[PDB]
Amino acid sequence: SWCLSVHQPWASLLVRGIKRVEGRSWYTPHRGRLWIAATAKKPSPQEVSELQATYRLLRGKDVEFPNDYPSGCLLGCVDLIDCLSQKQFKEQFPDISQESDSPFVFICKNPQEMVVKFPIKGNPKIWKLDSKIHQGAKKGLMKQNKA
Amino acid sequence: SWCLSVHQPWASLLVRGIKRVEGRSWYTPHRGRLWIAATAKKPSPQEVSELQATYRLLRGKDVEFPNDYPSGCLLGCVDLIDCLSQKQFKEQFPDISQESDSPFVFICKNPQEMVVKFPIKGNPKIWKLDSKIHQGAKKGLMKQNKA
DNA sequence: GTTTC
DNA sequence: GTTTC
């Protein structure tokens, strides 16, 4: 029931698990499940090319990118396990330390991506999902998980 | 008197010192001064964008790229101090290990860039500069160095 | 490699 | 944040 808005193409790289950390200028005390909504801003083909070229370097030529980078859309969720300073980030994750130069690095784990994505309007920083949106999206994910 | 042809935009990134290593599928025993010629293949604006975006990640937002990426051109030279396997590369250069995934990584140091660049036709692998080309280009660099 | 395509 | 511009 807490969500972070992110520009595409970064947003969909997060729920895919290709992008493993998210840099910001502010610290969050939030820990645990964090939904990811794409902002309304439409990514350009140049920005897609630039990001895909960057992650082909970081993850290798085999990386499979999202087919599409939808905007203004609830995409899925990550688990926010830590919010490190850049210093702690270079120390604790030395093999991916080049992946974020930001003052604070959001450590993302266990991503899940919604097959059916809901249109949504975001807010600054980390913001509250409506209970109905939350139950709906989480119900959709259970249909993706073994029951 | 030994030269390596490299596609742009990687070629100019090498003599600028922005790109610090050069990956290949083959090992060279060569050590020391290695000239860099851009191949004839003209780089597309998308490739420039993709590479510049990648190196803004690796070197930060302050990196200043070559104004132009001339093709089929003797650009300058690096010092080839070692030719590491990917294994040794990750061990010896853990702070930049993500910058090349190639089987062999050419460790480049002390780059120099010709202000006046000479048109040139390349050859495979590491090839011999003609003595007159070599003396011309090295004479141009001395004009760039303190005497 | 460059040039042709 | 979205929307306007």
Confirm if B23 and B7 have CB atoms less than 8 A apart.
Answer: no
Contact at 8 Å (CB) between B110 and B17? no
Q: Terminus-to-terminus CA distance in chain A, angstroms?
A: 22
CA distance B20 to B64: 15
Q: Is nucleic acid strand D under 7 Å from A121's C-beta? A: yes
- Do A57 and A99 touch, CB atoms closer than 8 A? no
The letter for the amino acid at B139 is K
- Written as one letter, the residue type at B53 is A
Report chain B residues whose CB lies below 8 A from the CB of A101: 57, 60
**In the block, which residue shows the tokens 């050590």?**
B31
CATH architecture, domain A2-144: Roll (2.30)
CB atoms within 10 A of CB A50: 21
Nearest to B96 by CA among B59, B66, B121, B125: B59
Sequence spans of domains, chain B: 2-144
Chain B positions in Cβ-Cβ contact with residue A49 (cut-off 8 Å): 46, 49-50
Q: Nearest-CA neighbor of B118 among B73, B71, B68, B76?
A: B73
DSSP at A146: -
Six token digits for residue A137: 């999206």
Distant-in-sequence, close-in-space partners of A30: CB < 8 Å, separation ≥ 6 = A2, A80, A83, A126
Q: Is the CB of B81 under 7 A from strand C?
A: no
Amino acid (one-letter) located at B23: G
**Nearest Cα residue to B98 out of A98, A50, A62:** A98
Please check whether residue B2 is in contact with residue B126, taking contact to mean a CB–CB distance below 8 angstroms. yes
CB A71 within 8 A of CB A40: yes
Residue nearest to nucleotide C3 (CA to C1'): B40
Local structure of A48: helix, strand or coil: helix
Give residue ranges of A with CB < 8 Å to any B CB: 46, 49-51, 53-54, 57-58, 60, 94-99, 101
Residues of B in contact with A99 (CB under 8 A): 57, 98
Sign of CA dihedral B5, B7, B8, B11: negative
- Please give the sequence-ordered ranges of beta strands (E in DSSP) within chain B, or none if there are none: 2-6, 21-24, 32-38, 73-85, 104-119, 126-128
A20 and A108 in contact (C-beta within 8 Å)?
yes
Token digits of residue B87: 């294994």
B98 Cβ partners below 8 Å, 6+ apart? A57, A58, A95, A96, A98, A99, B58
Taking the CA of residue A113 and the nearest CA in chain B, the distance in Å comes to 26
Q: Which residues of A107-121 are buried (b: 16+ CB within 10 A; e: fewer)?
A: bbeebbbbeebeebe
User: What kind of experiment solved this structure?
Assistant: X-ray
| Structure token digits, residue B83 | 């030719």
